[PDB]
Design an enzyme around this catalytic site. Structure first.
Site, mmCIF file in Angstrom:
data_model
loop_
_atom_site.group_PDB
_atom_site.id
_atom_site.type_symbol
_atom_site.label_atom_id
_atom_site.label_comp_id
_atom_site.label_asym_id
_atom_site.label_seq_id
_atom_site.Cartn_x
_atom_site.Cartn_y
_atom_site.Cartn_z
ATOM 1 N N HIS F 202 -9.585 65.078 -40.565
ATOM 2 C CA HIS F 202 -10.931 66.189 -41.290
ATOM 3 C C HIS F 202 -9.759 67.234 -41.726
ATOM 4 C CE1 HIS F 202 -14.320 66.022 -42.652
ATOM 5 N NE2 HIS F 202 -14.549 67.323 -42.162
ATOM 6 N N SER F 206 -8.486 62.985 -46.561
ATOM 7 C CA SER F 206 -8.111 61.422 -46.246
ATOM 8 C C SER F 206 -6.830 61.430 -47.272
ATOM 9 C CB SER F 206 -8.611 60.104 -46.996
ATOM 10 O OG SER F 206 -10.148 60.145 -46.495
ATOM 11 N N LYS F 228 -19.692 52.973 -52.431
ATOM 12 C CA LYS F 228 -19.305 51.568 -52.143
ATOM 13 C C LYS F 228 -18.922 50.883 -51.253
ATOM 14 C CE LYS F 228 -13.905 51.750 -54.204
ATOM 15 N NZ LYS F 228 -13.064 52.318 -54.358
ATOM 16 N N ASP F 229 -18.937 51.873 -49.796
ATOM 17 C CA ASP F 229 -19.243 51.556 -48.753
ATOM 18 C C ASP F 229 -19.991 50.306 -48.588
ATOM 19 O OD1 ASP F 229 -16.400 52.469 -47.613
ATOM 20 O OD2 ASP F 229 -18.034 54.217 -46.445
ATOM 21 N N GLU F 272 -6.902 35.105 -27.542
ATOM 22 C CA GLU F 272 -7.827 35.136 -28.033
ATOM 23 C C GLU F 272 -6.959 35.379 -29.652
ATOM 24 O OE1 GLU F 272 -11.056 33.679 -27.924
ATOM 25 O OE2 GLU F 272 -12.269 35.707 -28.502
#
Ligand SMILES: CCCCCCCCCCCCCCCCCC(=O)OC[C@H](COP(=O)([O-])OCC(O)COP(=O)([O-])OC[C@@H](COC(=O)CCCCCCCCCCCCCCCCC)OC(=O)CCCCCCCCCCCCCCCCC)OC(=O)CCCCCCCCCCCCCCCCC
Ligand SMILES: CCCCCCCCCCCCCCCCCC(=O)OC[C@H](COP(=O)([O-])OCC[N+](C)(C)C)OC(=O)CCCCCCCCCCCCCCCCC
Ligand SMILES: CCCCCCCCCCCCCCCCCC(=O)OC[C@H](COP(=O)([O-])OCC[N+](C)(C)C)OC(=O)CCCCCCCCCCCCCCCCC
Ligand SMILES: CCCCCCCCCCCCCCCCCCCC(=O)O[C@H](COC(=O)CCCCCCCCCCCCCC)COP(=O)(O)OCCN
Ligand SMILES: CCCCCCCCCCCCCCCCCCCC(=O)O[C@H](COC(=O)CCCCCCCCCCCCCC)COP(=O)(O)OCCN
Ligand code: HEC
Ligand code: HEM
Ligand code: HEM
Ligand SMILES: CCCCCC[C@H]1C(=O)O[C@H](C)[C@H](NC(=O)c2cccc(NC=O)c2O)C(=O)O[C@@H](C)[C@@H]1OC(=O)CC(C)C
Ligand SMILES: CCCCCCCCCCCCO[C@@H]1O[C@H](CO)[C@@H](O[C@H]2O[C@H](CO)[C@@H](O)[C@H](O)[C@H]2O)[C@H](O)[C@H]1O
Lengths: 71, 124, 85, 244, 56, 383, 54, 55
Positions: F202, F206, F228-229, F272
């Site tokens: 923060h 970003s 958008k998410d 896996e």
């Protein structure tokens, strides 16, 4: 009478004839090799599994759909 | 890395005739393929600025140059989000790609590196 | 390094006018057909090499390796397998 | 590894249940249960399936209770604390042919017939593997294969030598629905049945997936409209710059 | 026009409607795991004899 | 002043999900963060649900998972959702890390969110590994056996540590019960670190695909990134639906539907899919201890990207050579994955060694060289 | 059309009520529609199709 | 076939009755509780056991 018997025979004589011949030739060689003495005291004993798989794999590719269609 | 490092190394290359003969054409191609000019940026707009040194160099820009930089970043951000490229006058022509910031950051760094050196001086 | 609204930490801005229209006044899908075709083609063409080169190389590598491995575990490959171990 | 060591990979047969919108053929499931009961259950358990699971899949409640009531299960002790047996109920599990692993192995020349409740999920290939295996015993093993004693050659089984002999022959079962009980028919039916046993939710799961696909697709389409609608002010922004 | 606004709210409202229908389906199906499972539901229906039981 | 800003609690939500100032030009690769949040929520919801039906005793564990599949209403869904979302969690996490490497999110000033991220990635591996054991099928057991015997390579105390983690001399009931407790707990720890890496981020905000400052042009996180998410949430749920409802076992290994048998060893112990690259790295080193160190180093070496990237420019959008190198790096990481599931046979043994060398040499040699040269090309090329 | 807006959309309380009532109707009808469709594409396959024999 | 072995140290001390029903049948209906926890499972503890057996 089992539908698969006829379908497998048809696929061996037809689209998988080259593979059928390979397996046949192989079995001839191996049987003849087993017939000869001091085979038990050999290093490498040849099988026909590879050729068998090639044949079966081919037969299955040409048969699977046809077989399930008659059940 | 430091801009000083980049600048010094580049000067070593430009001095050597052999080296410049092979490197300068490559670097010109590289910059053409890089494609920052197609978003209307000048090279210097791309230098990482979240560093105390770079923040100081940006504060030392002449007001005009600073206002222009803000417009280029906003314009490029808008082209980025639109997935469009610059057209026409927005494309940075090779002659317009001037190193407006390199002088300022070289001065900031010069002082910062002198300060580090002098912090380690030993009287003889 | 980042502030908040009102003091975000931008160098002072001056001389930029921004204009936009309401979402209700716009066609959200204006020129979508053109973009879906011509714009996607442009953007993909520009990035194609950076995907094609590594993918084609690593696929070729894998193909060669998987085919060799398959061949080593056949009858024909007995001798080459014996040497490889 | 050699292909022998892996086993031949089974063909992809077109099962009724293959296909995003396809259920099992329940008539096949019922026939397959009859093959399990008359052939496999001699050696293989189906421990995770209760009589109640057949109800409304293969059998009516009455038929299934009849099957359960033919068997004896361990009851709670009587009042003198002596052990007791009771007739089976629908909540009982289908009982195994052997009391423990050791009994199972002793009856099968050392080999332990696995429980079949999950076998369709527990092998690469699923129904196709079960079908291929049961139908894939050649009349003669490929020349040069040395079978260990008490092993049978089957190319689909890894290593080739399986402790289970060929068991399906034309007319070992008499289907109650008049279907000709050929080796392939019985293998198809039993393989369908075991696939159901492994995944009994399969029919319901694919119907709910159809509903989910439809709703989630619609929401995806609408979410894209809404995103583009809300973002259009930002995409459509234009600037005019006058250097100060 | 009102027509114009209404259209975009029909899209938003459709999306809210499917989200509500989807959330109800999700919640109802998912929480039903907490309801008595099939093995529990089978252990109802206890049958008891009466021959054993004396008077009083 | 608006309540969302006035009230201390609301203000914290506000600062993260509503008024948070974001760059206006984040592309779809910035959506993996929220998908990983969605995966983490689905895993908590399905996980806690399975815990209400699962029994951690080794005599009953496998049976309890069958009970979930067969008896619990929608149990099949909860089980397959939990198992498949673990795969999707790793698809999203590799994508999110890939995004961060390509766009230079690890550079100053974001070294701290990146470094915490590397720890989140380790916790996710541990979490998923322990979860795998809980089924107590053959892959569960043979996985725990082999992986916990790697610890035996720690010199002097290694054996002792293994027996201490197992709670016995082999993988058995004690191991299963303790992995249940830890597998329940670790996702909460993982959630806390996820939240720490965001709090750390923060301060800078970003990064963005151009690698320039976004301080000039910010957008509120809501509504722009909220909506958008949703697109990627629905795209994810479509992929989720195809696996969970239509092919629930495509990503898994049938061997785990056989109950654990300490005597019988399965055909092939392969982990896996998402662990496979690290497994390939481990096989590449012949030494047992060497292999383990290399495998851990393959994850921890991400911590040095902030040092070894010498570029004056953040991210690869503008760096053609770095983009090519990154393409080769990513494809090599997938080839490592594939080599993790082949048999240890020629010619894959040598190939695996070469791919492992390539993996490490990206961080140690190529990225430092390439980033230095690109610095010089930008400067000379723009004179 | 203004009428439609004013009644069902203008007030959020009305809009959310309309969405939830629509969700209820959709949920019920979609269930029924899928059921019928699923039965037609899987005809003669399901237990309901063979149950009559017993 | 089932088998018996001699006891080992890890074995638990075996009970006199196979189940509750056998226990109650032998004790005119009453079920003698297991004594492993009886000292913690009654108010009084040792004092209760002592008092009861002597009382
Ligand atoms: C899995 C879980 C499900 C959730 C879905 C999330 C995935 C979404 C995402 O992040 O990728 C979409 C993403 C689209 O995102 P975007 O925000 O429009 O642009 C992001 C790029 O930076 C913009 O890249 P660009 O503008 O340079 O466009 C490049 C792209 C063209 O992008 C297009 O979408 C067309 O085409 C290619 O690179 C294809 C290579 C050639 C193949 C032959 O797809 C790509 O661009 C894929 C490129 C990867 C290689
Ligand atoms: C998850 C559950 C989804 C609930 C849907 C119920 C109705 C809410 C909805 O869809 O949003 C409409 C409403 C409002 O959407 P809106 O904010 O676009 O509508 C306001 C404008 N009018 C009222 C004129 C149409 O959303 C909310 O109130 C928040 C709830 C989110 C869901
Ligand atoms: C497969 C190999 C992928 C290589 C990508 C090379 C760049 C490219 O063409 O991508 C398109 C785009 C190019 O986008 P861009 O932001 O560079 O360019 C946008 C357009 N201009 C130049 C005008 C600004 O790249 C991405 O979006 C890459 C994201 C990387 C995700 C990788 C996940 C892998 C997991 C491994 C983890 C360890
Ligand atoms: C927790 C796990 C999240 C993953 C969701 C995927 C679908 C799971 C729901 C089960 C399902 O298949 O629902 C179907 C419909 O699909 C749907 O309509 C569901 C898709 C909708 C996805 C997004 C909506 C909300 C999901 C997350 C919200 C979380 C909070 C609320 C619980 C079947 O329908 P049915 O007949 O079974 O339905 C009962 C009422 N008739
Ligand atoms: C999962 C299931 C998702 C379903 C929820 C979607 C919302 C349903 C429609 C409602 C709607 O569109 O109205 C807005 C509500 O959205 C909101 O307020 C939320 C916007 C988007 C919903 C969720 C945001 C996702 C972002 C991160 C994803 C995280 C995944 C991790 C778990 C308010 O519209 P408005 O507020 O724009 O103004 C407009 C004037 N009031
Ligand atoms: C009289 C014995 C016997 C009969 C009858 C029998 N099986 Fe088996 N089966 C075995 C034994 C023993 C094995 C284990 C073989 C081994 O592991 O070598 C086995 C193994 C299997 C396996 C798994 C092979 C593997 O991959 O491990 C399947 C599936 C199987 N049987 C299904 C059936 C079906 C279906 C039927 C009949 C419809 C059937 N069996 C009839 C004894 C039998
Ligand atoms: C549970 C796992 C994780 C979750 C839920 C998560 C979530 C997020 C979110 C929501 C963001 C901001 C939005 C975005 O950029 O996508 C973000 C950013 C970031 N994450 Fe993660 N993350 C996780 C794991 C990781 C891992 C493993 C790393 C690194 C190895 C990482 C490194 C970062 C970095 C560096 C950023 C800043 C990127 C930027 O915006 O430029 N995270 N993460
Ligand atoms: C990051 C979060 C998580 C991941 C990645 C994860 C991963 C896994 C995986 C990979 C399995 C093996 C799945 C299988 O093949 O059946 C599993 C099983 C399990 N997990 Fe989780 N898990 C997570 C969170 C949780 C949480 C929070 C719980 C809460 C208890 C939980 C409870 C279980 C249980 C009970 C099982 C065993 C039942 C089963 O296998 O389905 N999980 N988990
Ligand atoms: C409710 C307030 C509490 C604060 C924490 C809750 C979550 C929170 O902050 O949500 C946000 C929506 C956040 N997204 C972003 O940062 C984001 C930022 C920029 C762009 C995009 N995408 C592009 O288009 C983003 O997606 C996100 O998904 O991060 C979760 C992980 C957080 O969960 C936690 O850490 C707590 C725990 C559940 C892990
Ligand atoms: C935040 C939560 C608020 C509290 C809400 C409480 C919700 C809990 C409700 C559980 C209700 C389950 O009730 C039951 O649902 C299942 C689906 O799950 C329905 O079941 C129906 O559809 C399912 C698939 O969806 C099929 O398996 C089934 O054959 C069919 O009958 C039942 O017809 C209903 O009887």
């Amino acid at each position: 009478p089992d539908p698969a018997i006829a379908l497998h025979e048809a696929a061996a004589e037809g689209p998988c004839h080259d593979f059928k011949h390979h397996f046949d030739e192989c079995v001839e060689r191996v049987t003849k090799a087993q017939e000869a003495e001091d085979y038990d005291h050999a290093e490498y004993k040849e099988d026909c599994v590879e050729e068998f798989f090639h044949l079966q794999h081919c037969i299955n590719d040409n048969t699977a759909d046809k077989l399930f269609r008659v059940l | 890395a430091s801009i000083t490092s980049v600048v010094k190394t580049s000067e070593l290359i430009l001095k050597s005739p052999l080296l410049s003969k092979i490197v300068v054409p490559l670097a010109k191609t590289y910059v053409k393929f890089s494609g920052y000019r197609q978003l209307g940026f000048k090279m210097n707009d791309l230098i990482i600025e979240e560093t105390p040194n770079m923040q100081l160099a940006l504060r030392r820009l002449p007001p005009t140059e600073s206002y222009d930089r803000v417009y280029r970043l906003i314009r490029a951000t808008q082209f980025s989000l639109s997935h469009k490229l610059a057209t026409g006058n927005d494309i940075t022509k090779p002659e317009e790609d001037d190193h407006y910031l390199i002088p300022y950051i070289l001065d900031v760094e010069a002082e910062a590196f002198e300060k580090d050196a002098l912090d380690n001086l030993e009287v003889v | 390094y980042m502030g908040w609204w009102g003091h975000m930490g931008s160098p002072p801005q001056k001389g930029i006018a921004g204009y936009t229209i309401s979402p209700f006044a716009a066609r959200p899908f204006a020129g979508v057909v053109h973009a879906a075709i011509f714009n996607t083609f442009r953007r993909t063409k520009n990035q194609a090499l950076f995907v094609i080169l590594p993918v084609s190389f690593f696929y070729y590598v894998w193909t060669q390796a998987s085919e060799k491995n398959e061949w080593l575990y056949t009858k024909a490959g007995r001798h080459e397998l014996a040497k490889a171990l | 590894m050699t292909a022998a060591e892996h086993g031949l990979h089974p063909a992809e047969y077109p099962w009724p249940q293959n296909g995003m919108l396809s259920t099992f053929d329940h008539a096949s499931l019922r026939r397959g249960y009859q093959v399990y009961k008359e052939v496999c259950a001699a050696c293989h358990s189906l421990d995770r399936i209760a009589w109640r699971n057949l109800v409304g899949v293969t059998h009516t409640t009455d038929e299934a209770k009849a099957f359960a009531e033919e068997l004896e299960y361990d009851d709670e002790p009587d009042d003198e604390g002596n052990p007791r047996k009771r007739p089976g109920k629908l909540a009982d599990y289908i009982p195994g042919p052997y009391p423990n692993e050791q009994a199972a192995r002793a009856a099968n020349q050392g080999a332990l017939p696995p429980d079949l409740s999950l076998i369709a999920k527990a092998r690469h290939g699923g129904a196709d593997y079960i079908f291929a295996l049961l139908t894939g015993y050649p009349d003669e093993p490929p020349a040069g294969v040395v079978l260990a004693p008490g092993m049978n050659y089957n190319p689909y089984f890894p290593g080739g030598g399986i402790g289970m002999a060929r068991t399906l022959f034309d007319g070992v079962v008499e289907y109650e629905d008049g279907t000709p009980a050929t080796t392939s028919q019985m293998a198809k039916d039993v393989a369908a049945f075991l696939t159901w046993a492994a995944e009994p939710e399969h029919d319901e799961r694919k119907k709910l997936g159809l509903k989910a696909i439809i709703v989630i697709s619609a929401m995806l389409g609408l979410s894209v409209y809404i995103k583009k609608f809300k973002w259009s002010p930002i995409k459509n922004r234009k600037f005019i710059y006058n250097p100060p | 026009t009102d027509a114009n606004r209404l259209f975009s709210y029909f899209m938003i409202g459709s999306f809210g409607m499917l989200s509500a229908a989807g959330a109800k389906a999700t919640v109802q199906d998912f929480l039903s795991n907490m309801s008595a499972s099939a093995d529990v539901l089978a252990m109802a229906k206890v049958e008891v004899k009466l021959g054993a039981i004396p008077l009083g | 002043m608006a309540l969302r800003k006035k009230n201390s609690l609301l203000n914290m939500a506000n600062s993260y999900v509503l008024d948070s100032p974001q760059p206006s030009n984040l592309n779809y690769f910035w959506n993996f963060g929220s998908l990983l949040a969605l995966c983490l929520v689905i895993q908590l919801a399905t996980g806690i649900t399975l815990a209400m039906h699962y029994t951690s005793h080794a005599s009953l564990a496998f049976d309890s998972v069958e009970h979930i599949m067969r008896d619990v209403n929608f149990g099949w869904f909860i089980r397959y959702a939990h198992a498949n979302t673990a795969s999707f969690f790793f698809i999203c996490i590799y994508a999110h890390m890939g995004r961060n490497i390509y766009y230079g999110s690890y550079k100053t000033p974001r070294v701290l969110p990146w470094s915490i991220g590397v720890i989140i990635f380790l916790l996710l591996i541990i979490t998923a590994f322990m979860g795998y054991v809980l089924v107590f099928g053959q892959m569960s057991l043979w996985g725990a056996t082999v992986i916990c015997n790697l610890v035996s390579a720690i010199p002097w105390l290694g054996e002792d540590i293994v027996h201490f983690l197992w709670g016995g001399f082999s993988v058995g009931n004690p191991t299963l019960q303790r992995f249940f407790a830890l597998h329940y707990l670790m996702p909460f720890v993982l959630a806390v670190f996820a939240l720490l890496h965001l709090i750390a981020l923060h301060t800078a905000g970003s990064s963005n695909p151009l690698g320039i400052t976004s301080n000039v042009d910010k957008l509120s996180m809501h509504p722009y990134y909220s909506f958008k998410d949703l697109i990627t949430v629905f795209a994810f749920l479509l992929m989720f639906t195809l696996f969970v409802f239509f092919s629930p076992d495509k990503l898994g290994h049938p061997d785990n539907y056989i109950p654990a048998n300490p005597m019988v060893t399965p055909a092939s112990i392969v982990p896996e899919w998402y662990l496979l690259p690290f497994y390939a790295i481990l096989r590449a080193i012949p030494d047992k201890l060497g292999g383990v160190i290399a495998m851990v180093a393959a994850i921890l070496i991400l911590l040095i990207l902030p040092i070894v990237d010498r570029s004056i420019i953040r991210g690869n959008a503008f760096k053609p050579i770095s983009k090519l190198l990154f393409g080769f790096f990513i494809c090599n990481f997938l080839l490592l994955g594939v080599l993790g599931q082949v048999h240890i046979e020629p010619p894959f043994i040598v190939l695996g060694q070469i791919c492992t060398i390539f993996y490490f040499s990206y961080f140690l040699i190529l990225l430092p060289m390439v980033s230095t040269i690109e610095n010089i090309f930008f400067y000379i090329g723009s004179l | 059309a203004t009428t439609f807006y004013n009644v069902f959309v203008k007030r959020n309380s009305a809009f959310v009520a309309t969405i939830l009532a629509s969700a209820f109707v959709f949920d019920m009808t979609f269930e029924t529609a899928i059921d019928n469709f699923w039965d037609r594409i899987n005809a003669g396959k399901q237990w309901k199709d063979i149950r009559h024999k017993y």
